[PDB]
């Protein structure tokens with residue numbers, strides 16, 4: 001009933017001698033990747049892995065990481081990716097919450113980062129390496145598993161970035177990850193020959209396609225080394241040197257790549273998603289020659305749930321059409337569907353919906369409602385995002401249900417202000433926000449970076465805006481910054497923009 005592993009293995013048997021991973025002039029074949037992963041999967045099964053059991057994984061970005069995650073699935077378990085640079089506490093919360101059976105890790109990480117209270121399977125330990133390399137290396141029969149793997153069995157537990165709040169753990173089933181990858185194979189026409197770039201951190205669920213989609217399709221993950229993760233020059237050079245057709249990043253990161261490595265986007269299939277895509281960015285990407293495909297989706301519904309090819313700068317907030325076996329309801333405050341063109345909160349149903357939050361069963365009930373247009377135990381995720389349907393059936397993101405109460409009797413579209421600001425040649429990026437620095441005095445503030453070799457006069461910026469937008473939308477104060485604050489995932493952090501006087 002685990003079609004995922006059967007498909008993965010069906011693929012490795014049909015291209016045994018192609019390359020499936022490549023990292024720093026090292027390549028592995030499909031047969032090699034799976035033999036290596038099969039051996040671990042047996043050793044895992046001996047370490048207490050079974051269906052719905054969590055295998056903590058703390059490994060640098062490496063072929064060694066991509067092999068392990070594959071092993072965990074083969075073992076019928078579910079993986080929780082830890083971060084070896086994370087403070088002990090971020091990692092200690094996750095271990096206490098998810099009760100991992102075993103930690104797969106490496107002996108080159110400081111032994112105190114891996115001293116977490118779990119059993120350890122350490123790949124580079126002389127001995128574990130001996131036992132591992134000695135195990136039978138064939139694909140596992142279900143006899144060699146702990147128990148048959150169901151479609152409801154967990155694939156992975158990703159943890160959520162709560163607004164300075166208890167991190168929530170999302171439980172993604174196998175049928176949901178299998179469904180996403182199948183849709184992504186179909187939308188991208190991904191197969192042998194094709195190279196995809198694997199760069200995104202494993203604790204960010206946007207990585208999940210970069211980790212399993214090459215396995216699933218017979219493409220080749222070109223793993224960027226850990227150092228190239230933050231150097232956008234080196235990534236541009238890697239993209240060009242190793243002829244990478246497809247890569248996936250947040251818009252913040254795609255911006256950096258254009259600023260520093262314009263040539264790399266020539267003939268490059270960008271997958272962008274995670275924040276809003278400005279019209280300015282969308283034009284830049286297209287000017288440099290990139291094929292742009294936009295993906296939207298909460299982590300509580302796998303990774304992505306909608307896709308839109310961005311043909312031109314108009315489409316920047318068109319998040320497109322639902323992926324396979326996904327259903328998108330845009331409903332009112334009483335859970336009633338709205339008429340085409342009317343705004344409403346986006347509810348997501350179908351195969352990609354998670355099982356719920358991990359042992360936070362109260363907040364589960366508040367965000368995973370019973371699927372109102374489904375049956376039995378089906379569930380629908382309340383995204384918390386407002387959308388409108390255009391006549392063509394495509395959807396457009398409008399904003400977050402919360403950040404929508406009027407400012408001084410008027411609805412403010414904080415994107416319009418940014419697009420206004422981003423038309424001045426002295427500005428690169430703009431972010432707008434409604435501030436409350438003294439309670440009751442809500443005010444519009446906008447933030448700007450500089451275009452290369454220009455200085456934004458932050459008073460004439462208000463002039464420039466005041467002739468394009470309603471006066472109630474002109475920011476009280478504009479503020480120029482050297483760089484924008486970012487989240488660990490490399491998204492703009494609007495909660496950390498400093499207040500003006």
Ligand SMILES: C[C@@H](N)C(=O)NS(=O)(=O)OC[C@H]1O[C@@H](n2cnc3c(N)ncnc32)[C@H](O)[C@@H]1O
Nearest residue numbers: 160161273274275276295296297298299385397
């Ligand atoms: C809490 C955290 N673990 C989490 O759930 N992160 S999330 O990114 O998966 O959730 C979705 C959040 O990011 C926004 N978003 C994602 N893609 C977008 C896109 N393509 N266009 C415009 N907005 C996009 C959504 O509107 C919503 O704000």
